[PDB]
Structure formats: C-alpha cells, structure tokens
Write a protein that binds this ligand. Structure first.
Ligand SMILES: NC(=O)C1=CN([C@@H]2O[C@H](COP(=O)(O)OP(=O)(O)OC[C@H]3O[C@@H](n4cnc5c(N)ncnc54)[C@H](OP(=O)(O)O)[C@@H]3O)[C@@H](O)[C@H]2O)C=CC1
Ligand SMILES: NC(=O)C1=CN([C@@H]2O[C@H](COP(=O)(O)OP(=O)(O)OC[C@H]3O[C@@H](n4cnc5c(N)ncnc54)[C@H](OP(=O)(O)O)[C@@H]3O)[C@@H](O)[C@H]2O)C=CC1
Ligand SMILES: Nc1nc2[nH]cc(Cc3ccc(C(=O)Nc4cc(C(=O)O)ccc4CC(=O)O)cc3)c2c(=O)[nH]1
Ligand SMILES: Nc1nc2[nH]cc(Cc3ccc(C(=O)Nc4cc(C(=O)O)ccc4CC(=O)O)cc3)c2c(=O)[nH]1
Ligand SMILES: CN(Cc1cnc2nc(N)nc(N)c2n1)c1ccc(C(=O)N[C@@H](CCC(=O)O)C(=O)O)cc1
Ligand SMILES: CN(Cc1cnc2nc(N)nc(N)c2n1)c1ccc(C(=O)N[C@@H](CCC(=O)O)C(=O)O)cc1
Ligand SMILES: O=c1[nH]c(=O)n([C@H]2C[C@H](O)[C@@H](COP(=O)(O)O)O2)cc1F
Ligand SMILES: O=c1[nH]c(=O)n([C@H]2C[C@H](O)[C@@H](COP(=O)(O)O)O2)cc1F
Lengths: 507, 506
C-alpha cells in the first residue's frame, strides 16, 4: 500500500483544465508546483510514478520527465520496453500495479486529463487531491475536472498568488475514512476558573459557525482573517445595546492581516460593491463632506446618517439634508479647520495631513511617523458620526513596499468591515503609485468588533461558503496627483464572488 | 504499562511545599486542581492511585479521597486489609505494582512530600510533572520539592491566577525519551520567495525562542512579549532612523494581557515599576515640566529634554526640560495654545481624560471611549511625537474595563515593558474611579523594533523561563484620578530575574 494523489489545475467556477489539446493559460509557478510535488520523496533509491492519458502524453511532447517514471494509459500505444522512464498500460486499474508490487515506486500521482481524473475518482483510487484553482472563467474549455466527491474534505487553502494578473491559490483535499495531555489540563482549569481564565473569554468557535471547518491547520487564505473574526464574535460576542435600536454581539480587541502584493483583499464569499468603496475613498481624498456628491453618483451608503430626521435626533437640525459635517477627508485635508457648512471653500484652511503624508513618504521613507489621524475631539460634536477608522500608519519596507496599519474603534462586521478592508487597501495602493512604491501588507486592529442582530441569518449564510482566490486590482494609468483618480482608471481582474447578501444598516 | 505523574505545588524560587506538617498557604483552587487532575480517567470501572508518604497521609487527616485509592508509603503502618481505599506498602519500589499487574488501576499519581518526590525522581519512575508555582518566598519552609532533573522539559505554562492576592500558575513537565500540509507549504515557499507572505513572517528559530520546549502551551501572557522579541530577531529588517543607532524592525504586531487575575509586569527582567507610575501620574496631572520627574529621581525624559537635543530639533527657545505639549497636555488641554511649561493651562483646551471618565460611568456601552494624543497642529512644538498614540476603553457586561492601545513606534528593549505596565495601571485607575474591575489589555504596534545595542541584552532575557505575574492592588479609594500616589500602590508577589542594563537611543 502507498499513496495515490491527484495533481490538477482547474478554473475556479467551471473547473476547466484544457482547450484544444493544451492548457487554457500559461502560469510558470504552477508548473514548478507540479515539479516539486511529484519529485517530493524520501527514499533516494526510489522514484515517483506519474499516470497520465495518451492525449495528455501528446500535449507534453511525448518526452519523459526527469527523475520520474511516466505511466501512459492507452489502447493503441505499443508497449515498448526500450524507454524505462515511459511505460504503457491498457487500463487504469491494471496500471495501479505499484501498490502490491514494484517496490521501486514510492508515491503515485494522477494528472492525466478528464478521462483519467474521472475514472480515478469513480473507481475510488485517489487518497488526496492537489488543486490549483485559476481565476479564469470567461474563456473556452473543452476538458473539465470532475466535481470533487463528498468523500473528500479540504484541509488546506493557500494565499492568493498572481501571475500575469491571474489569481490562483493551492488547495489540498483529503479522503475521509473514519498535544494529548495538554488539552485536558487546560479544560480542567477552565472548569475551576470560569470567566477568571482568559481562555474562556476567547473560546474557539464551534464547528457549526466555523467556515469550512475541515481546514483546521491550513487556513492560509487571508479571507479567513475576516471569516474567523465573524466566527469568534458569534461564539463570544456579548449581547449589548448601542445608540441605535438594533443590538449587537460585541467583543473587544481583534485584528486581521491581508496581503496586497499578490492579490487584493476583496471578499469573495459575498459580492462586494467595489465601485461604492472607491467613490467613497476618492470622496475622502478630495476633502469633501457633501453627502449629495455620493448620491449624485448613485452611492447611498451615507444617506442614513445624513437625513433630516437623523440629524435632528443627534442635535444637528441646523444643517442641510446631507451636510455630514467635518468628517473623514476634512480631518485629512483641513485638520483643526473651523467648519461652517458643506458649501464653503476650505482650500488652505486646516492642516493638510494627506499632503504632508505623501511628501514624507518619498522624502523620508524609514520615518516612523507616517500617521493619518481623524480623531479630533474639538470637532466630534459637529460630526454626523465620529470616525470609525480612526488612525492609520504607513511603513516603507526595505524592498520599496508600502504597508498599512489601521485602528478601527467600532467595526460593523456585516457592512462596514468589508468596505474598510478594500477601502484602505486601495488607499495604500494609491499612495504607493504616487510615491513610487509597491503595495505591501494591510493590518486592521479593531476595538468594538460586533455583529448586528439583524445580520445573523445573513452572516451565517456567508460562513457556509468556501472562499475563492482574491481578485487583482491594477491601475490603468499613472496619475500626477492622488486626487486625479477616477473609477475608469481601475481594472478589477478575476473577481468571481458568491451572490450578494442584502443587509440593512443601523441608523 | 501505564502513566506515572507527579502533582505538586511548590514556591516559585526555593520550591517549598510545606512547613510544620502543613502547607505554607491556603489556595482552594489549587486543591480543586489536585482533585480534577487525579480523578481524570477514561475507564469507569477503574480508579487512579495516589501515592503519598506517611507524614503526608497524616496531614490530610488519615481519611480517604472519594473515587480514588490512596497508597501510603510507610515502614510502621499496619498492612490493614479492612479499608480497600487505603493500602500500605513498605517502600516506593514495591509500591509500583500497578504497572505490569493489577489492571484495575488506570493512572498513577505521586504527591507524597519531599521524601517520596525525591525518591520517585532518583529511581526514575515519573513520566510527567504537574507543578503549581506559588509566588510566596519570604516565609519559612521545612520540606522542599527537589530540583527538576534535566531529563524533564516544560510543555505548558498557564496564565497567572490570583487567590487572596497570591499569584500562581500551572505548568506541565514531560520526560524526553497535519502530515502532508507542512511539505506543501514549504514547497510553495521555495517557488515564491518573498512573494509568499508566510516567508515574510517566518517562525522564530529555536535558538531565539524563549523556552522552546513549550510549543503548544504558551498560555502565559508574558510570551506575548517574549515571542514578539523572537519574531523581530527572525524577520526584522536592518533599518536606520533619526538616532545614530539602527534597529531591526517589523510592522504590524500585537500582544494581549490579562488584568483580572494578574498584573502584566515582566518577570524575565526587573522592571522599574516606580518610574513607570511617576510618569503615568505625571501625564494625568497634565504636566509637561520634565524637571518634576528628575525632582522625583526619574531620568527617563532627560535624553529627550537636554539643551543639546532641543536645539538639534529646532526648539532651542525652550527651557532645559520643557518637553512641550506632549502626553498629558493633549489629555487635559487638547488643541490648547501652548506657551511654556510654567504657564497656567487650567480651563484651556479639551479635557479628554475628564470627558473620558464621565462617559465611562454615564454611558459604558458607548463605542467612543477614546483618548488620543496625535495632534498634527502641535507636532512641531513637541520634543518627541507620541509613541502610544491612541487608546480605546471598553466596559464589559460583567463591569470590567478593557483597554486597546495603538503604538506607532515601540522600542522593545525599553519603551515596551514600560508601555505594558503604564497602560495597565491607567486602566486600573480608570476602573476604580468609575467603579469597575480591570479587564484585558491589548497593544497594537506599528513599528516594533529592537535597537542594535540591545541585541546581547534581549537575547539574555530570552534565555529566562518566565515566572508568574505579580499582583497590583490599591491601598485606598481615591476621589479624583489625579490623587493617586506611589504609597497607595502595593505590588504583591514580584520575583523577577536580575535587571538588564540597556542604553536609550536619543
Ligand atoms: N490543467 C491540468 O491540470 C491538466 C490539463 N490537461 C488538459 O486536458 C486535455 C487532455 O485531456 P483529455 O482530453 O481528457 O484526454 P486524456 O488526457 O484524458 O487522455 C485520454 C486517452 O487516454 C486513453 N484512455 C483514456 N481512458 C482509457 C481507458 N478507460 N482505457 C484505455 N485507454 C484509455 C485513451 O487513449 P487512446 O487514444 O490510446 O485510446 C484516451 O484517448 C488537454 O487539453 C490537456 O492540456 C491534461 C492534464 C492536466
Ligand atoms: N505542596 C504540596 O504539593 C505538598 C506538600 N506536602 C507537605 O510536605 C510535608 C510532608 O512531607 P515530608 O516531611 O517529606 O514527609 P513525607 O510526606 O514524605 O512522608 C514521609 C514518611 O513516609 C515514610 N517513608 C518515606 N520514605 C520511605 C521509604 N524510602 N521507605 C519506607 N518508608 C518511607 C516514612 O514514614 P515512616 O515513619 O512510617 O517510616 C516517612 O517518615 C507536609 O508539610 C506536607 O504538607 C505534602 C504533599 C504535597
Ligand atoms: N451602523 C453603521 N453606520 C454607518 N454609518 C456609515 C457607515 C458606512 C457604511 C454605510 C453603509 C454601507 C452599506 O450599505 N454597504 C453595503 C454593504 C454590502 C455588503 O457588504 O454586504 C452590500 C451593499 C452595500 C451598499 C451598496 O450596495 O453599495 C456600508 C458602509 C456605516 C455602517 O457600516 N454602519
Ligand atoms: N528611543 C526612545 N526614546 C524614548 N523617549 C522616551 C522614552 C520612554 C522611556 C525612556 C527611558 C526608559 C528607561 O531608561 N528605562 C529603563 C529600562 C530598564 C530595563 O527595562 O531594562 C531599566 C531601567 C530603566 C530606567 C530606570 O532605571 O527607571 C524607559 C522608557 C523612550 C524610549 O524608550 N526610547
Ligand atoms: C500533464 N501536464 C499538464 C499539466 C499542466 N499543468 C498542471 N498544473 C497542475 N497544478 N497540475 C497538473 N496535473 C498540471 N498538468 C504537464 C506535466 C508536466 C509539465 C512540465 O513541463 N513539467 C516540468 C516543469 C518544468 C518547470 O517549469 O519547472 C517538470 O519539471 O516536471 C507540463 C504539463
Ligand atoms: C496530599 N495533599 C497535600 C497537597 C496539597 N496541595 C497540593 N497541591 C498540588 N498542586 N499538588 C499536590 N500534590 C498537593 N498536595 C492533599 C491531597 C488532597 C487534599 C484534598 O483535600 N483533596 C480534595 C479536595 C477538595 C476540593 O477542594 O475540591 C479532593 O477532592 O481531592 C488536600 C491535600
Ligand atoms: O467605516 C465604518 N465602519 C464601521 O464599522 N461602521 C459602523 C460601526 C458601528 O456599527 C457604526 C458606528 O456607530 P458608533 O459610533 O456608535 O460605534 O458604524 C461605520 C463606518 F462608517
Ligand atoms: O513610550 C514610549 N515607547 C516607545 O517605544 N518609545 C520609543 C520608540 C522609538 O524607539 C522612539 C521614538 O523614535 P521615533 O519618533 O522615530 O519613533 O521612542 C518612546 C516612548 F516614549
């Protein structure tokens, strides 16, 4: 008995693997993965066997692979014994003569197109699947990878990588069949001390609220940094009241990291309105607090906090309909500026923090003070809503990459959080291009991480969806000033999300 | 064959376990731990055997323990067969008749004082040690727990618990004698070099990992700081800064601390707790006069407040130690027109700390309890921009006050141990004035760095296995938060390692 694994690279939705006798793409890093995963062995005096079909054998030029024995399944190829690195069998069952015989073969790999993939799964020969999901779906396929049967469970999902603006990840599927004393001692201490033991205040989420719970040790995909935060809130969130009529389940002190070098952290478990995120971000940068400029561009996310009824409730009945007051983008461009109304001209007033940030980022990159704040206690009472994303710090690595850290005092995990993840990712990328750097990492530190109680059935639905590789975000042109970005200048490549989920905002 | 474990509660330094035929302390949670750890079994038709010496058998009243069979080692006690829950053997060697025979016993526990402990380790009978370190050392002991032999390695260290202002933790010692996922991740790390984010956050090597045998049981929250040191030494990029001393820096790190059952004061190094407090009360009082700290023998702000340093950053018009509007001037007089350190600022600016205290008790579930120090209109007037920039506070449902701090730049050698204790005390002060209890402390860090002249020092600190945190209690209740004094603070059970000298980069 030995191991039999499948190596395959299929598209993310339709699981396409080929077209016209060749691959639908050209990803060199994926081929290197095929090389290292099929050459990985222990016994130096043994080799691995790679089973493939005839049409696949033709697609690789009918030439052997170094240090590996290729097994071709064909009904016509002559069983020539001249080449010891290439052997031909008449059927897939007989080809698996390496389990009970031929001790020179250590591991077995299946990689031979739809015919061999489907027959290897139907006849129950495969123990493990190495899947490379490619984010390409509006192209033509003629051979597909069969749907993974229910007997397999995912145990690993890598981060999203990029090659020629093509997103792809790497997954491992295992076939289900059926320290030791440290966990017991911790459980006993949790019975003695109830809430006195901090571990009992941060309980690990139950399987029923854990997204794809079979992936236990391989939660590398950074969308899990958000999905696992939802699970931790559903498990430990305290039922609390707030200024709105809608209570939340809240915990305090959480973080989540995202990579921006090889992907863009736009959630795939739900179709996120990327256009509204951008139009809000450019709305901040331009220094604008007029809420009508977003409604004029069909962006209604700031309508609730800018109605005549809401403004009179918080004591701002003297303002216009959508006069949100000095908020994000007024502390960015005119910090400590005497705010009047949304119609006045504030050019030159206040401290232009964003400009000083951009100028400092290229003139002194290793400076430890690249900070953009929005918490002005002298102007909180004039704001329609105090800042949620309060403070952000920026950092230039040695390889000329721009990372970003954000502190968020209050995080609506249902609506605001997916917006804040993408918004500050775009902002860092904008700052990276204007300063001549590359995107780095994104860390978001959260204070009051909460779920509104009317989002429970929606967020539980979102947790039932296994994530997909992140898309790519590229800029079409180089701008001279950061205020010059437009929505047409943004290209979103390879975004194949799950259907959108409607959730109401608590005003 | 079955398992043989030792259960013991010894003091933190001298490993004392008894005095005059009784325990040196009275910790009820420790007895429950002994109860649950000796009753833990699988087979319902089997019992666990507790081996003890005669003097220990007398100390527990010579009465049996429920659901367990007690084995007494004595040379005089009669081998009475009347009680089946109490059996007597003449020596510890003969007593181990439960391993290869007598299948009714599942697990074996040794817990019988110094005489049995020392012979159980000398004759090499013990597979595991359950140690309860108690932070009591200036009392009298007469029986000690023998030094743990080198064949045992720690595999678990719990958080610090508190009982009657007594700190104690729980450790597990073991005697040294997925599958395909780790390989696939390594291969991806060879294909993509620094393109894979995992390679930018490499796990620290064993040579720089504090107590590396504790792999799955790093519960003690001092590891939240020691492991941050390890991550910097592994991935820190050599970078220059405004000082002449370069650092190894990483970006985006955090560490949590408990304040309910302990106080996060580092034990791997004797931290100057008095200087931390006098600086914190100096902030609360709204003071920027750097002489008031030197008058109280606190020299931490001397480097950033000298005539030479102030002229260099363009503040030569200030007095010697006039640090300018810094911490405690943005707390009490935010956006206030700063003049000098001698002027009267009563009533000017926005008093954030006062508004914070009033909001914490009048509206605890409010999500806006924020105390900021980053004022871009006054950065040029400051002798040093704020490192601990923003802090947020949170009132739990059980009336506990937690704290979140964002720190833009963190000197892990000097500033970090100060910032951990400083914001812990501040949260406790806010908790008493508002009528709550201390909760949790989370510190989010931007530029977490180590100065290159701290390398041999911090590597020395990583060689020390941590000890349970001390306790911090206030002797009296104050009416206003500014009224705290150093005499009002009682530090209980602080037994740290010797201090480590490190120079500050000006
Ligand atoms: N993305 C990826 O990971 C991979 C993609 N591909 C792509 O898939 C395409 C090729 O795959 P595909 O079209 O399905 O053809 P196959 O690679 O599956 O090969 C099929 C051939 O194998 C022989 N064969 C298959 N089944 C049997 C059987 N039950 N008994 C005897 N002989 C059998 C036959 O050869 P004969 O004519 O001699 O009878 C048959 O024509 C290409 O585009 C290729 O690039 C291929 C491998 C991997
Ligand atoms: N903190 C903790 O976890 C614990 C603390 N303790 C404390 O320790 C103290 C008691 O320990 P200690 O003073 O060392 O006494 P012991 O509990 O170790 O008991 C010793 C007695 O056991 C018998 N005995 C010991 N060794 C042998 C041997 N090799 N052969 C035959 N008989 C033997 C002898 O009794 P005999 O005279 O009959 O021959 C001896 O006097 C108490 O204060 C107790 O409270 C005890 C247990 C746990
Ligand atoms: N309580 C509270 N008050 C707040 N005031 C201001 C904000 C910011 C904000 C306000 C509204 C939204 C919003 O509707 N988003 C949205 C989310 C999803 C989804 O992600 O499922 C899908 C579609 C949309 C709308 C669209 O279609 O564009 C997002 C962000 C805010 C908040 O989030 N919560
Ligand atoms: N670069 C830089 N600039 C900064 N400006 C202001 C600070 C705050 C600060 C300034 C100085 C210290 C300091 O000397 N601490 C200290 C540490 C140990 C030890 O823990 O081994 C032992 C003794 C002491 C002194 C004592 O004896 O009290 C601590 C904190 C700061 C900084 O830390 N770094
Ligand atoms: C059967 N086949 C089609 C093909 C293409 N991409 C895939 N990608 C994946 N993830 N899995 C597969 N089974 C797979 N198969 C192959 C097999 C080997 C090579 C190949 O050229 N292998 C060289 C790769 C050289 C390299 O660039 O380092 C090797 O050393 O094995 C190409 C296509
Ligand atoms: C031998 N001995 C001394 C003693 C005291 N503290 C210790 N503490 C530790 N960590 N380990 C020991 N071996 C230990 N031994 C004992 C043993 C049992 C009880 C005892 O009363 N046990 C009850 C405890 C009841 C409880 O409070 O729940 C039980 O159910 O086991 C007291 C002292
Ligand atoms: O960017 C935002 N992110 C966010 O999470 N919220 C949510 C958090 C919370 O539900 C509400 C803020 O109300 P409060 O100040 O009371 O926490 O808005 C709002 C934003 F504008
Ligand atoms: O409370 C403090 N914590 C801290 O870590 N520093 C260190 C961080 C850094 O080593 C230096 C500030 O230099 P910079 O302004 O370049 O960050 O002070 C200073 C404090 F006052």
């Amino acid at each position: 008995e030995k191991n039999v694994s499948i190596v395959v690279a299929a598209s993310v939705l339709s699981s396409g693997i080929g077209i016209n006798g060749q691959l639908p793409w050209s990803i060199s890093e994926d081929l290197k993965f095929f090389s290292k995963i099929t050459n990985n062995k222990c016994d130096s005096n043994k080799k691995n066997a790679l089973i493939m079909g005839r049409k696949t054998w033709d697609s690789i030029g009918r030439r052997p692979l170094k240090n590996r024995i290729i097994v071709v399944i064909s009904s016509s190829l002559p069983q020539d014994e001249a080449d010891p690195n290439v052997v031909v069998f008449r059927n897939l069952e007989d080809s698996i003569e390496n389990l009970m015989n031929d001790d020179s073969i250590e591991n077995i790999f299946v990689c031979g197109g739809e015919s061999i993939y489907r027959d290897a799964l139907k006849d129950n020969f495969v123990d493990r699947i190495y899947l490379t999901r490619v984010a390409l779906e509006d192209i033509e396929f003629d051979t597909y990878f069969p749907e993974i049967p229910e007997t397999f469970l995912p145990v690993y999902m890598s981060q999203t990588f990029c090659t020629k603006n093509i997103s792809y990840d790497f997954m491992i599927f295992e076939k289900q069949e059926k320290l030791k004393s440290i966990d017991d001692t911790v459980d006993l201490l949790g019975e003695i001390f109830g809430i006195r033991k901090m571990g009992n205040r941060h309980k690990f989420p139950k399987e029923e609220i854990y997204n794809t719970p079979s992936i236990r040790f391989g939660r590398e995909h950074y969308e899990f940094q958000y999905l696992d935060l939802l699970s931790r809130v559903l498990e430990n969130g305290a039922y609390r009241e707030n200024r709105t009529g809608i209570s939340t389940y809240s915990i305090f002190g959480q973080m989540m990291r995202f990579d921006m070098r090889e992907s863009f952290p736009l959630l795939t478990t739900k179709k996120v309105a990327i256009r509204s995120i951008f139009e809000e971000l450019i709305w901040f940068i331009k220094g604008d607090t007029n809420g009508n400029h977003l409604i004029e561009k069909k962006v209604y996310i700031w309508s609730g906090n800018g109605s005549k009824e809401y403004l009179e409730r918080i004591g701002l009945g003297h303002r216009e309909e959508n006069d949100l007051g000095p908020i994000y983008g007024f502390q960015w461009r005119h910090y400590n500026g005497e705010y009047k109304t949304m119609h006045d001209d504030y050019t030159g007033v206040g401290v232009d923090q964003l400009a000083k940030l951009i100028e400092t980022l290229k003139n002194n990159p290793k400076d430890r003070r690249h900070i953009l704040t929005a918490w002005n206690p002298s102007a909180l009472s004039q704001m329609a809503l105090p800042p949620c994303h309060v403070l952000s710090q920026y950092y230039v690595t040695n390889d000329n990459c721009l990372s970003c850290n954000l502190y968020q005092r209050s995080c609506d995990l249902g609506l605001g959080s997916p917006f804040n993840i993408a918004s500050y990712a775009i902002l860092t990328m904008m700052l990276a291009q204007v300063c001549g750097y590359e995107p780095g990492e994104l860390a978001i530190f959260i204070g009051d991480a909460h779920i509104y109680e009317n989002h429970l059935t929606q967020l539980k639905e979102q947790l039932s969806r296994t994530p997909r590789p992140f898309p790519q975000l590229k800029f079409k042109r180089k701008v001279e000033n950061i205020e010059d970005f437009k929505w047409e200048d943004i290209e979103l490549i390879g975004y194949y999300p799950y259907p959108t989920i409607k959730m109401d905002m608590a005003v």
